[PDB]
Every structure is written in C-alpha cells, then in structure tokens.
Design a protein around this ligand. Structure first.
Ligand SMILES: [Mg+2]
Ligand SMILES: [Mg+2]
Ligand SMILES: [Mg+2]
Ligand SMILES: [Mg+2]
Ligand SMILES: [Mg+2]
Ligand SMILES: [Mg+2]
Ligand SMILES: [Mg+2]
Ligand SMILES: [Mg+2]
Ligand SMILES: [Mg+2]
Ligand SMILES: [Mg+2]
Ligand SMILES: [Mg+2]
Ligand SMILES: [Mg+2]
Ligand SMILES: [Mg+2]
Ligand SMILES: [Mg+2]
Ligand SMILES: [Mg+2]
Ligand SMILES: [Mg+2]
Ligand SMILES: [Mg+2]
Ligand SMILES: [Mg+2]
Ligand SMILES: [Mg+2]
Ligand SMILES: [Mg+2]
Ligand SMILES: [Mg+2]
Ligand SMILES: [Mg+2]
Ligand SMILES: [Mg+2]
Ligand SMILES: [Mg+2]
Ligand SMILES: [Mg+2]
Ligand SMILES: [Mg+2]
Ligand SMILES: [Mg+2]
Ligand SMILES: [Mg+2]
Ligand SMILES: [Mg+2]
Ligand SMILES: [Mg+2]
Ligand SMILES: [Mg+2]
Ligand SMILES: [Mg+2]
Ligand SMILES: [Mg+2]
Ligand SMILES: [Mg+2]
Ligand SMILES: [Mg+2]
Ligand SMILES: [Mg+2]
Ligand SMILES: [Mg+2]
Ligand SMILES: [Mg+2]
Ligand SMILES: [Mg+2]
Ligand SMILES: [Mg+2]
Ligand SMILES: [Mg+2]
Ligand SMILES: [Mg+2]
Ligand SMILES: [Mg+2]
Ligand SMILES: [Mg+2]
Ligand SMILES: [Mg+2]
Ligand SMILES: [Mg+2]
Ligand SMILES: [Mg+2]
Ligand SMILES: [Mg+2]
Ligand SMILES: [Mg+2]
Ligand SMILES: [Mg+2]
Ligand SMILES: [Mg+2]
Ligand SMILES: [Zn+2]
Lengths: 100, 100, 115, 151, 83, 127, 211, 224
RNA sequence: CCGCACAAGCGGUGGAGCAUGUGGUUUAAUUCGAUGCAACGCGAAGAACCUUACCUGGUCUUGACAUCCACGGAAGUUUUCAGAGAUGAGAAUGUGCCUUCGGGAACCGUGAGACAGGUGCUGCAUGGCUGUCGUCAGCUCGUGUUGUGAAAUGUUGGGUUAAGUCCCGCAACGAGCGCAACCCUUAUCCUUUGUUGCCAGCGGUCCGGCCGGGAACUCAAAGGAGACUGCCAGUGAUAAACUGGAGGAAGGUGGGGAUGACGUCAAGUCAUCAUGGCCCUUACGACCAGGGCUACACACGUGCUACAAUGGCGCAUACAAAGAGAAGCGACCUCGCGAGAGCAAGCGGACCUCAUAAAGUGCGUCGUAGUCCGGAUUGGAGUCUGCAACUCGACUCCAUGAAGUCGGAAUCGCUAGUAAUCGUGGAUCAGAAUGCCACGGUGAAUACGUUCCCGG
C-alpha cells in the first residue's frame, strides 16, 4: 500500500492511545443506566469534539510487512501472502502444511 | 501449600517429551513423588489461505499449528525441590507455567 | 358472525378464524381469546352469541379493518408528501428499506417488462 | 463401470420381518435420508393390508409385486449408428426393483390425505392387477411389442 | 434506529449554529454537511442547506420533519430514468 | 464372572458388561425401550443375543457416548459381540459369519476446498 | 504446473524450522515482526559476510540468534568486535537482551542459499548465465552432492523475451519427503530487471525422520 | 573326450536336413532319417584344441564365461562355472553386456549395494513393505547378474552352447576380440567361433559332457 | 483404451421471491482488476465513517512517510475561540543524561536543496506467486546398436495394471524426472502415564463421580504391533497377474488428504510485494468533510427459501463432533412479550463461558385449501454495536401476508458413510454471512455396458 496509508494507520493507532481513558469514561457516562439527562447530553456532545481518529473502530488491520488491508490474519499480523511465504521458509514456529 | 503443578506447552512433541522427562528426573532424584506427565489434549489451530495472489480462490492451502500439552503434578515437594526446579532452563521451544 | 366488520371469520378453530380478520394476527388472536376466556381450539360454530359479543368487544380494543387501513394509508402519504427519501421511493414504487435494485426487486417493481 | 463391474451394493434385511425385499422397498421410498419416517409409513400400509385387503401382509407384498413386474423393456441402443429401440429382458432382481419403484411412484399421485393410505390403496389395487401402477408395466410391454422389428 | 437511552443525535456545531440562528432569527440558509443530525423541534421555521455531496440543497424545516435526519430530505443520487 | 466388550461405530464408544442372570438390559441407566425410540435400533442391539440364542441367560450393563442413536446402536451391537465372544469364545465363528465383528470403519468424509461437500461439486455454469 | 515449496513441505519431516520459540496469541505477531526485522537488518549487514541462514531461538527472558555463515572470521571480526556490535543493535530491535552465535557451513558449495547468491552476484557482474550455472552444478557435484538442480529465470543476457533455463545433474527427487532437499531462492537486480535463481541440492535421504 | 565317449552320449546327433547352414558342410558326416549327422572325427581334434587353449587361458589367471540360455540347460551351464570357480550367463543374454560393460558394472554395483545393505541393517528403518520390495529387487538382480557379480572385468574366454541361439554374444565378443568357444550344431553359422566345436546342443546330456570336460580342463589349468 | 464422458440411478439448475457477482444502462462518481472450459458468492477471510484507490468542495507544497544540515526551543501536558473538518489563532509547564559548562541526545517547530511520494502506464520488458490441460502417465538421457545421414531403437510387441505398474518377448542395457513408497489422518490391538478426563468392583451418599477411593473401562497422547497377494484353490504362457476362499478390526494401492513430471496457453497478477523502462512532481503527491463503490427499463452466472400432510403448528422428551475465548468468551440471579439490559462468578481454559444441536421420538391438532403452506413486501414500535445506522447495519416485537400449486428447450453434481437432508463451529470482524472454510447426525438408489456425446 502507499506510504501515506501506513502513515494514516500509525497516526490512528497512536491517537487512539492518548484518548482511550477519556473516551472510555465518556462512553460509561452516556450508557449509564441511571444518570442525569443533562450530564448524559453533555457527555454525548463532548464525545464528538474528540478527534474522530481516536476511536478504535476506525483502524484497519493491515499486513505489517507490506500494509495490505485485505486477507489479514490476527494470529500472525500478516496478509495471506506474506504468511505463506514466511511459512514455507520455516519462519513461523510450528506452522506446517496440514492434512487429515 | 506443599503441592506444585507445572504445565508445559510446545509446538513439537519431541521437545516437550524430553522437557517432561528431565523435569520428573530432577524431581525424582530429590525423592519427591510426581504424577508422570499427563498428556493433555493437543490443540490444532488450522488456517487456510489463498495460494494465488489474485483471481483464483478455489486454489488455496491449509496450514496447522499443533500445540502439545503436558501436566506434571508434584504432590510432596521438599523445599530443595522447589528451587531445584527453577535451575532447569528448558529448550527455547517450551513454555512452562508453575502453579502452586 | 360479523365480529370486527363486514368480513366474517370461518367456522374453523377460533384462533385461526380471528386471524382471518384484518389487523388481527395469531398473537393478537390468542390475547383476544384469553381476555374472553374462550379456548383456542373451539370453533366459531358451537359458540354462543354472548360469547361472540364479548369477542366483538375485545376486538374493539385494537384498530382493525378500515380504521387501520386508513391509518396505514395516511402514514404512507405523510412520507410521500413530506419529500423524504423513503417517501420518494414510495412514490416511485421501489424498495424503501435499502434492498438492492440491480436485481431481485420484482415484488415492488412488479412483473418484468421487456425493452 | 468401464473396467471392473462392481454391481449393486448389498443391503441388510428388513428389521421387522427379516426380509431384504421389504428392506429394499423402504430404501426405495425413503426421502432425504429419513429411514424411520419411511418405514413407519411402510409398516402401517402393510398392517392395513394384513387385516382387511388380504390374509398376510408380507405375502400380499409379493402378490402385488409380481402383479406389476414387467418382462421385456425397450432399452434404446443404436447398434450401428441408427436409433434402434431394442427390447431386452429384465433380470429378476432388477425386475423386483423396477416393480417397487413403480409402485411408489403410483402411490405418490394417489392423494387421499395421507401417505400410508396411498401406499395401502395402490399396493392392493396393484395386487388385483387394477392399479395406476400396472398400467406403466403394460405400457412398457406395449412399447416393447411395437418395436419388435429390431431383433 | 438510535437507542432511546442515548437519545436523539445532533452534531455539536449544527446545534450551536441553530441556537445562534434561532436567537437572532437570521432566516438565512445554514450551510451544513451534517446529514447525520436529527431535526429537533427548535429547528422549525429554519432553512438549512444540507450537503448532498456535490451541492447544498435548501431544506425548509416543518414540524412534520421533527424526528428525521437532515440527510433524509436531501437526495444524493441522480436518476432521471434510462430513457 | 463379568465379561466386557468395547464396541465403536460412527464415532460412538460403547462399554458393555455381560453377566449371567434374568436377561435385563440397561443402557446409560435406562431400559432399552427408554433409550432408543426407534425399533430398528432395538433389534440391532438385540441381534447378537438373538443369533447366539442367549437372550435370557445374560444381563447387560451398557454405557455409550458419542455419535447418534443409530450409530450408538451399532456400537452397542459391536460391544455385545465382543463381550459374547470373550464369554464363550466358541461363538466367534457364528458371530463373524453374521458379520457382527466387522467393526465397519466407515466414517464421515471431510469437506474439501473448492467442493460444497466431499464428493459434491459446485454447478458448472452450463459450460 | 506449480511445485510445492520443497523446504516447507519437509518442515517437521526432515527439515527443521528457522525459528524455535513458543508464544501465545498475544505475543505471536509481535515476535514475528521482531524476527522479521532482525533478519532484515542482519542480511543488510552481512550481505558481504556470505550468511547462509539465521535461526532465532527465544528463551522467555531473552533472544538468541545463530548465524550460519560461510566466512565466520569476517562476521566475528577482529577480536569479536562487529559481532558484539551486532548483538547491541539486535538487542535494540528485539527490545530484549540478545545473544549471537556463529556457525560455519564447512562446505559453502553445498548450501543452496550461498550457491544462489553466488550465481546472482556473478549475474550482476555480467558473467554469462550458462557459465555460472554449469560451474555451480559441477562444484556441488564434486563435493559429494547426490544431485543438484539450478534454474535461472528472467531476461537472460538482457534478451527482450524472458526465458527460464535450468540444468540438473545427478538425482533430485522432489516428491520424496524422506529426502534431504536443501532449497533456497535468490535474485539479481541487473540493468534489465530481476533475474530469479532457484537451486535445489540433494544430500541423500534421511532415515528415522527428524532423528 | 574319446569318439566312443561322445557317441554314447549322442554327440553325433543333429538338426533336420530341412534346417541346416551352408558353411557346416565340411563338419557333416551325412544324413539319416532326414537328420543331419555330425562327424565325430572332425569334432574330437577341434574339441581337444579348444580344451588346450582354455587350459592355457586358465593357467594365466583366465576368467571364463560359460554361456547358455536354454531353459533346461541353464542349471548345467551355471553348475560348470561354479565347479571350476568361473563366471556364467544362464538367464536370457542381455544385449551389449560386453559392449556396454559400464552399464553392467552399475547393475553389478547396485546388486552388491542391496546385498551389503541387507547384511548391514537399516531394513528395520525402512517400512516393512519397503524392506520386502528391496528384497524382491535384490532377488531379481541376483538371478540376472549372479554369475558375473564377481567377474570384475571383461572375461578372457567365452564358452557358448548353441552358438546360433546366442548370436548376439558372439557378435559382441568378435567386436571385442574376446575368443569364442562354442558347441555348434549343423544349423549354426560357424564364422564367429574361433575354436569351433560342431556338436549337438539341444540334448542336455551332450551339453553336460562338454561342460564337464571344459570344467575339469579349466581346473587342471588353475592347479598348474 | 480410460474418465460421473455416456448409460443405469438419485437429487438439482432453467419458472417464483430474495441474497450475491457480472454485463449493460445511469451517474458528479458509480474506483481498479478477473472474461470460453480455466472470469461472474472471483481478488474482497466481511465498502455506514475508516477501508477508499472514485466524485464534489475545502486546503498543503522538502511535503502525510526517510536520511542529511542550519536556526530556535526540553519532550510531553491542560483549556478557549473560528471552521464541516483539514487547519488558524491563542492562553496554562520544563531542567532526567555526561556534563573536558563546550554542548551533544530524545523530540518539536522553521528555512533552503539533494530528494521524498505515485493503488500513475506496460503482466507483450520482468522476478515471485497462481490457474489450466491433469494427479492425466507420461517426458527424457547416458552408453550400446541401426542407418550415407536427418534419425531410430530403448519408450514398440504379447499380456497385465490406477500407473512407461509389472512380467515375458525383443539390440538393447540402464538411468533421471514422473508412478508407487517415505508424510498426515482414519479403522483394530498392545505398552506407558491418569488430571481438569474415567467409574467396573467396592463404604457412605444431600442420589450429583458427588466423596472416600479405584487405574479396570471410555478417553487423552507418546511409543509400538498389523496387510505382504503372506496363506489356500482355480485360471493364466511352469510368467506377471486375475478370480475366489480362509484367517483377520482391516484384503488386494483398506478409506481420505498432502504431494501436480517436461511442457502448453506471450493464460492471470506492475493494485500484496519486488522490479527494467517511460510518466507526474505548488501535482497523476498529501490532508479533510460529505457523497459514491449499495443506482435500476434490463440480460447472464452462482446460491438461499419455498411451493407443503414423508408436511405446518403446540406441548413433552432424547443422542453429537469439531472449534473459539483477555479491550475476550461472559454463567447464575433479577428486569423485559422479545432482541436485550442490570448486577456479577468463572476461565488464557480436558476445569469456566460461548452452548439447549436440529432433523428424531411420543402425544394433540390441521384435512389438501393459495391453506394453520409460503414468507416477500410495506406500516408502526424497539434493542445493540459504533464519534455516527438518512443515503446504507444486524436483530426483535405488533400488524401486513406478493409470487409460488414442482418449473420449456437445455443443463449440472454424485459410485458409499457418497448423494440427499439436518443442525454446529471458525476465519475476516466494533457491528455487519444465504458466501467461504471446517464438524458431526440421519442416510439411499443404481452401474447391462462402452454404441453415441465430452476430454485424454
Ligand atoms: Mg510502496
Ligand atoms: Mg473495520
Ligand atoms: Mg481450546
Ligand atoms: Mg408476525
Ligand atoms: Mg444491504
Ligand atoms: Mg425503524
Ligand atoms: Mg455431512
Ligand atoms: Mg446420465
Ligand atoms: Mg430468470
Ligand atoms: Mg431461478
Ligand atoms: Mg459498468
Ligand atoms: Mg467492477
Ligand atoms: Mg466458489
Ligand atoms: Mg480537489
Ligand atoms: Mg468550533
Ligand atoms: Mg541544538
Ligand atoms: Mg518547512
Ligand atoms: Mg521515486
Ligand atoms: Mg504472461
Ligand atoms: Mg489484463
Ligand atoms: Mg493417475
Ligand atoms: Mg498407457
Ligand atoms: Mg513416449
Ligand atoms: Mg523414440
Ligand atoms: Mg503394453
Ligand atoms: Mg517407472
Ligand atoms: Mg522392452
Ligand atoms: Mg457405591
Ligand atoms: Mg492403563
Ligand atoms: Mg499411533
Ligand atoms: Mg496395504
Ligand atoms: Mg495351470
Ligand atoms: Mg471373511
Ligand atoms: Mg477374502
Ligand atoms: Mg495405507
Ligand atoms: Mg506419489
Ligand atoms: Mg498445487
Ligand atoms: Mg497477455
Ligand atoms: Mg492496472
Ligand atoms: Mg491525488
Ligand atoms: Mg473520506
Ligand atoms: Mg462491489
Ligand atoms: Mg407458517
Ligand atoms: Mg469468532
Ligand atoms: Mg422473563
Ligand atoms: Mg455460537
Ligand atoms: Mg417433532
Ligand atoms: Mg397465483
Ligand atoms: Mg449446511
Ligand atoms: Mg463479526
Ligand atoms: Mg475422443
Ligand atoms: Zn542346435
């Protein structure tokens, strides 16, 4: 992927770290079963002012070696292509062709 | 109390077997009685990825990681045995959890 | 008998016969019978007029038949003249809940028309 | 089957009457792998024929079988590059198979608001040689007799 | 449908724009991109230019439109028919 | 005085313990009519004792795990066969000739890539 | 058609892994990235040190890198300086205490990675490919390889139409899993693009499997 | 061998007058019952001359190849070589065995490797099916090359039974200059045999008499 | 002469509704690619934003990402205003490191260039990777021989095999790559170890393997044993082999996988990556908001649900396997008709959770009807995830109750635990499966044959 895409990914994964606690407590206030309506309303209005990139659901798992956004595997952090070419080289511990 | 329970995980059974063998050997030469390694069910984590970089999907391969478990219970540990264990560095491929 | 209007329930089991009436479904029918105290499997025949009258009075709780049809027509018209997107798709006779129209939209577009 | 001819797979005898014939029958009207669903229809439609249609259910099965069995069947085979409807003889076991396969197809069109009722009705009617099932056998025979010119 | 617990959603900038408008009664179209905001009762009688992605459609707000999203009254796709 | 046999069918394991007695059968702490709703399963379970003509001379304590009721009935039949031939040891020819020591190894075939099911293939799109 | 990667299909049969550590899902992708970066840096450093392979064994509190190389004096250096230097920087990227071990491929003419890089280094000095292939093959066969297969793929000699040319001596049974097939792939970025080089070397069948 | 010794064995017997070769006229006594009769008077000096050359070759460490592929006579040809410690071909002759010595040497090496491997071990390491398959391959090689496993190099002399049947062998020998000693029936072409013995070859008893005399003469040469 | 190629069978597709992909058309854009078999539930193992490459508009110019230098400041941290946001303007703090007191480091800002950047073109410049013929049985070579020689022989012939498998024959003898075997898994047994798994014999049981205990059995997972035409009979050329039989859990490569020869298609991919060349560089690079990839007269492919009594509905009650889980799976309990909510145990897991399998069986009902079949579509009202469900999510509840009464020509899959049918799980993933990948339950019919079609 383009270098700018990887830069976007690292920026998003860093911005979602310096806002995790504030976002957590704001979301706690909003979805509180018993809370003041005005306090819940202000939590809702404050949750928007944070950078939109600070929400963990805007990150996209990209392959670490290339940045491929499709075919990613969490167990390895690599797309289906790099997983295979590392596996065949014996680079992934324990991985091995399967038959049964 | 006086009871140790160690669990060994590996990706190769030919390594975990010798790990267990030497651990019970050490625990035995101090006179502690141990349950010989209990083979717990091995986990087979299966992945299936597309060999073709583009267009083909029917063509794909299947990899597998088999993690092997062993359990060793030491029922009456002499306090020399507890430290005599930690003087055992197992092969890099093995993971040890020691509960008491 | 005319429990909810001109339409008449069949002589079959009461729960099914009540469903035949517009605005009444199998759930509503079970609720109507429970309030009346009538069982679900008794037929409309073998049922006394007082019983059928309490059936009518329980049916009167819900909006059924014409008073409901008019209500659903008005709900549709509200959207249609409100100018909202869903009203637009109502007026063009296309799926209004986001289904695809590249294909499989026949129950709203109707039969296929060649070129 | 081009090099070695395996032939039909062997089947276990019917559990209730220890008869392969009836076992093949339940296998031939079983739908979607529903063995018990089919044999619960079979055994009822045979019990009903036991008490009223005849004296014995298992023997009534045969008296309906040979009452619908065909003998000469046109198996269209081009001998030398011409469409020839050559008539050939059916083997005994394939004869029983064709017979039961036709009787189940007859019971399917019966209706009668049940499945046991249909099977009983048509198995009887065929045992008397007056069933929707026997007509297909005599039509096989009609088509065999028409095409005698190719022997 | 947004949860009743959460309550109706509205973009903060649009809320403040609408307050500042309904205060002085500018009655001037509000150039907004917030198609995802709900129409609140205090927006009745305003004209809001909602972005359709190429331009700003002037939606004049009535009370029937309360409880609806701004984006619902602005069409995004253009279909004049195949023929 | 207790004879044991293990029987496996279609991923079902059945431990069978046979002893001289009334002829009662108990499968997983339940009678034969309670455990198997079908009748074909019942006659499968009873086939060996029928064949060897020892139906009232043995009490059967059976437990079975895995598979389905039809598969379990086959596993119980294989276990009973083994326990019988471990009891008398001359019944082996009679049981084998009846095919009860077959231990049929048919098992479910795995699904394969590019196939909807093993030996099943997507439609060819007319060409 | 296409062949299975001959090293990958023998993993755990006769070939061992290049990485030997256990990790759960939380640390697995991290460890893979760290191994990747370690290998990348070590290749970029010892390109001229004729490294053959890099195996990586991670104890719970540390990392250990073994470097199978052909000229150990170059990489160990004068008084073990550069190697020690290496340790520092790999301990920097693995973010964990490190340790470097050096192993010598006594016969560089029988290790597929070194043969491949030799051929590509010659192809980048404009040695004609047929000479490189033939002399690699016979140098391997001299030293007791049961069989060797070399294959150069690409615009050979700069020709506009690319073509693959291979050459095999002796016996290279690829379908036998019992066999000890050492296979590695290299590539030369010549003035006209990439030329691929694959090389299989058969050292005889292994009995007793891994042992 | 004396003329009486041959005649009782039937050495004079031959093929039918219908089936003879032109160059054999000098060696043919005549015909009886449409059967060619071989003249023992011609045969006895030529057989003695062949024995004298074979004894001389044997005395100087001569390796002798007894050759015969007759189904019935194959065991006798093998036995004669075994008695005098020599090499033989009793199974069907392989084309270019002498000319393609290298390929035959590779086959001999493969036979030696398989037998050595079975004695050494590793059959247990091989799968039981593989070990049985290796034994079958060893047996097939042992039947085909058992006689010449220990020949080491190209032989110094050849003894051939029914030279017409084994014509490829004699063509090879002449191409190599290796001398040919052969029992030549009337139907054979005698050009390829440098020391030609005209006599029956079909009868096992006649072949045994020639083989026994040659084996004893070779043994006398070894004893010196 | 072989192959689900046909025949013999069983079930489909083609008709209906919907899901999905493609063409076409439309559009500001509907991003790019894949196109007879061998593209069309394909790249994509998961487009609301992000992804995102596309369009509209707003913005930047050594730059979002790298090194180099110079200048100025620790870095970081808290809040205000303007703006859709990008950004712009501001307000609230430091002193850790050696300090040869010079300064350098971590970082941030700024200026100038060398450069960065490109999912820009070419897969007819390429590497790598893949499809396909085809898991078809072939493709070759050394030496010998034959021929004036191109070449041939081996590799053909007789048989026989799944097989260039094997034997005999034969100027061929051998070998290499294939074939088979070595690998995984499945079926039987034995040895070893017994918890979190097991409960036969026992003691009590709150009747729960629960608790003393037991190591037998199931099971777990490591090491072994076993099948080889080995044994017998017949056929066959005293051959290979074939047919049958015994024994045996297994019988004739037992079942299934992995494994894809030399090559073919200038096949696919420059958009994973890498890469020769060309091209852009205050723009074809970069940032942001909103829209689009989801359009809709239509055509095609692949699927799902059906059209029903072998069934629908209600009630009661059985029997699985394989998996996943730490920002995770989340019990019990309470609240809610329900999706769910609250509270909160346990579990990095043979322990805890996901998680009750469903077809099945028993009882009752329905009575062949556009129905108590079917569930499309639409209305009203909700729950959850998420900054955010208008375009454009899933799900629940109430109501609505289309087409459909088994589908023309034509065409597809399948030879056994297979087809058919029934559920369960996983990857991707905040959420979003009728796809894909896997798992078990129930469980067939038929194969006379090799004339024809199809490919070798
Ligand atoms: Mg790049
Ligand atoms: Mg996402
Ligand atoms: Mg687990
Ligand atoms: Mg409803
Ligand atoms: Mg949708
Ligand atoms: Mg709604
Ligand atoms: Mg299945
Ligand atoms: Mg057909
Ligand atoms: Mg259509
Ligand atoms: Mg259709
Ligand atoms: Mg288009
Ligand atoms: Mg497209
Ligand atoms: Mg597909
Ligand atoms: Mg612009
Ligand atoms: Mg503002
Ligand atoms: Mg400075
Ligand atoms: Mg600057
Ligand atoms: Mg550049
Ligand atoms: Mg190409
Ligand atoms: Mg193209
Ligand atoms: Mg094959
Ligand atoms: Mg052939
Ligand atoms: Mg050929
Ligand atoms: Mg040739
Ligand atoms: Mg042949
Ligand atoms: Mg071969
Ligand atoms: Mg030949
Ligand atoms: Mg007790
Ligand atoms: Mg034990
Ligand atoms: Mg084992
Ligand atoms: Mg075998
Ligand atoms: Mg014979
Ligand atoms: Mg038998
Ligand atoms: Mg047999
Ligand atoms: Mg096998
Ligand atoms: Mg193979
Ligand atoms: Mg492949
Ligand atoms: Mg092309
Ligand atoms: Mg392109
Ligand atoms: Mg641009
Ligand atoms: Mg955007
Ligand atoms: Mg799309
Ligand atoms: Mg219904
Ligand atoms: Mg999951
Ligand atoms: Mg409740
Ligand atoms: Mg679940
Ligand atoms: Mg039921
Ligand atoms: Mg109609
Ligand atoms: Mg399914
Ligand atoms: Mg998800
Ligand atoms: Mg043809
Ligand atoms: Zn002769």
């Amino acid at each position: 992927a383009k270098q700018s895409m990887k830069a976007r990914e690292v920026k998003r994964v860093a911005l979602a770290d310096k806002y995790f606690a504030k976002r957590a407590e704001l979301k706690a206030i909003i979805s509180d079963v018993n809370a003041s309506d005005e306090d819940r309303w202000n939590a809702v209005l404050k949750l928007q002012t944070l950078p939109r990139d600070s929400s963990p659901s805007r990150q996209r798992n990209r392959c670490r070696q290339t940045g491929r956004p499709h075919g990613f595997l969490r167990k390895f952090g690599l797309s289906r292509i790099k997983v295979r070419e590392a596996a065949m080289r014996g680079e992934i511990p324990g991985l091995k062709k399967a038959s049964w | 109390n006086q009871r140790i329970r160690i669990r060994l995980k590996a990706f190769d059974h030919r390594l975990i077997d010798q790990a267990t063998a030497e651990i019970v050997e050490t625990a035995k030469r101090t006179g502690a009685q141990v349950r010989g390694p209990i083979p717990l069910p091995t986990r087979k984590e299966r992945f299936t990825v597309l060999i073709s970089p583009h267009v083909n999907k029917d063509a794909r391969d299947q990899y597998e990681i088999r993690t092997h478990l062993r359990l060793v219970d030491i029922v009456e540990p002499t306090e020399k045995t507890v430290d005599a264990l930690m003087r055992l560095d197992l092969a890099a491929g093995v993971d040890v959890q020691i509960s008491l | 008998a005319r429990i909810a209007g001109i339409n008449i329930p069949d002589h079959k089991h009461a729960v099914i016969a009540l469903t035949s009436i517009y605005g009444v479904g199998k759930t509503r029918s079970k609720a109507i019978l429970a309030a009346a105290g009538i069982a679900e499997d008794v037929k409309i025949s073998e049922l006394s007029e007082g019983q059928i009258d309490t059936l009518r009075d329980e049916v009167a709780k819900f909006v059924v038949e014409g008073d409901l049809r008019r209500e659903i027509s008005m709900s549709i018209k509200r959207l249609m003249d409100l100018g909202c997107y869903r009203g637009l798709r109502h007026r063009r006779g296309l799926p209004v809940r986001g289904q695809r129209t590249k294909t499989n939209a026949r129950t709203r577009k109707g039969p296929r028309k060649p070129i | 089957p081009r090099r070695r001819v395996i032939g039909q797979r062997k089947i276990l005898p019917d559990p209730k009457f220890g008869s392969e014939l009836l076992a093949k029958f339940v296998n031939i009207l079983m739908v979607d792998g529903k063995k018990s669903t089919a044999e619960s229809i079979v055994y009822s439609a045979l019990e009903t024929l036991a008490q009223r249609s005849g004296k014995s259910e298992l023997e009534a099965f045969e008296v309906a079988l040979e009452n619908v069995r065909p003998t000469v069947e046109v198996k269209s085979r081009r001998v030398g590059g011409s469409t020839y409807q050559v008539p050939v003889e059916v083997r005994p076991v394939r004869r029983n198979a064709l017979a039961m396969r036709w009787i189940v197809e007859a019971a399917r069109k019966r209706g009668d608001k049940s499945m046991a009722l249909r099977l009983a009705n048509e198995l009887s009617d065929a045992a008397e040689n007056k069933g929707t099932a026997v007509k297909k056998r005599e039509d096989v025979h009609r088509m065999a007799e028409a095409n005698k010119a190719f022997a | 449908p947004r949860s009743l617990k959460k309550g109706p959603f509205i973009d903060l900038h649009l809320l403040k724009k609408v307050e500042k408008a309904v205060e002085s009664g500018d009655k001037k179209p509000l150039r907004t991109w917030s198609r995802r905001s709900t129409i609140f009762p205090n927006m009745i009688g305003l004209t809001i230019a909602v972005h359709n992605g190429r331009q700003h459609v002037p939606v004049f707000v009535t009370d029937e439109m309360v409880g609806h999203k701004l984006g619902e009254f602005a069409p995004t796709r253009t279909y004049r028919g195949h023929a | 005085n207790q004879y044991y046999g293990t029987g496996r069918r279609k991923s079902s394991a059945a431990r069978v313990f046979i002893k001289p007695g009334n002829g009662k059968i108990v499968i997983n702490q339940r009678s034969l009519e309670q455990y198997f709703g079908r009748e074909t399963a019942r006659m499968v379970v009873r086939q060996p004792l029928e064949l060897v003509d020892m139906v009232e001379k043995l009490d059967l304590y059976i437990t079975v795990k895995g598979g389905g009721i039809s598969g379990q009935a086959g596993a119980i039949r294989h276990g009973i066969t083994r326990a019988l031939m471990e009891y008398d040891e001359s019944l082996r020819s009679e049981l084998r000739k009846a095919g009860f020591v077959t231990r049929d190894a048919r098992q479910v075939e795995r699904k394969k890539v590019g196939l909807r099911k093993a030996r099943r293939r997507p439609q060819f799109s007319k060409r | 058609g296409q062949k299975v990667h001959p090293n990958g299909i023998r993993l755990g049969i006769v070939k061992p892994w290049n990485s030997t550590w256990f990790a759960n899902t939380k640390e697995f992708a991290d460890n893979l990235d760290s191994d990747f970066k370690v290998r990348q840096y070590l290749t970029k450093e010892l390109a001229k040190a004729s490294v053959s392979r890099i195996v990586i064994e991670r104890p719970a509190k540390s990392i250990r890198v073994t470097i199978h190389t052909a000229r150990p004096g170059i990489v160990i250096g004068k008084k073990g300086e550069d190697v020690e230097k290496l340790r520092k920087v790999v301990a920097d990227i693995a973010g964990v205490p490190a340790q470097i071990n050096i192993a010598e491929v006594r016969k560089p003419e029988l290790d597929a990675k070194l043969v491949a890089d030799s051929i590509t280094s010659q192809l980048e000095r404009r040695v004609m490919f047929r000479r490189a292939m033939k002399r690699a093959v016979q140098n391997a066969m001299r030293l007791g390889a049961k069989g060797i297969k070399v294959e150069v793929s690409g615009r050979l000699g700069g020709a506009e139409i690319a073509r693959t040319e291979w050459y095999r001596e002796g016996r290279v049974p690829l379908h036998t899993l019992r066999a000890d097939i050492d296979y590695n792939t290299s590539e030369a970025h010549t003035t006209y693009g990439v030329i691929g080089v694959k090389v299989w070397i058969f050292k005889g069948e292994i009995l007793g499997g891994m042992a | 061998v004396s003329m009486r010794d041959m005649l009782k064995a039937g050495v004079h017997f031959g093929h039918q007058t219908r089936y003879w070769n032109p160059k054999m006229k000098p060696f043919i006594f005549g015909a009886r019952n449409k059967v060619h009769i071989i003249n023992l008077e011609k045969t006895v000096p030529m057989f003695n001359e062949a024995l004298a050359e074979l004894n001389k070759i044997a005395s100087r460490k001569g390796k002798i190849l007894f050759v015969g592929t007759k189904r019935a006579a194959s065991e006798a040809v093998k036995d004669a070589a075994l008695s005098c410690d020599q090499f033989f071909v009793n199974h069907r002759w392989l084309g270019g065995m002498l000319t393609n010595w290298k390929t035959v040497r590779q086959s001999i090496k493969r036979l030696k490797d398989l037998e050595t491997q079975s004695q050494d071990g590793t059959f247990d390491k091989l799968t039981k099916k593989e070990a049985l398959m290796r034994t079958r391959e060893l047996e097939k090689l042992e039947n085909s090359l058992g006689g010449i496993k220990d020949m080491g190099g190209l032989p110094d002399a050849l003894f051939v039974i029914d030279a017409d049947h084994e014509h490829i062998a004699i063509k090879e020998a002449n191409n190599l200059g290796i001398p040919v000693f052969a029992i030549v029936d009337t139907n054979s072409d005698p050009d390829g045999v440098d020391f030609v013995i005209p006599g029956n070859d079909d009868a096992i008893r006649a072949v045994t008499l020639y083989l026994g005399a040659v084996a004893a003469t070779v043994r006398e040469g070894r004893s010196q």
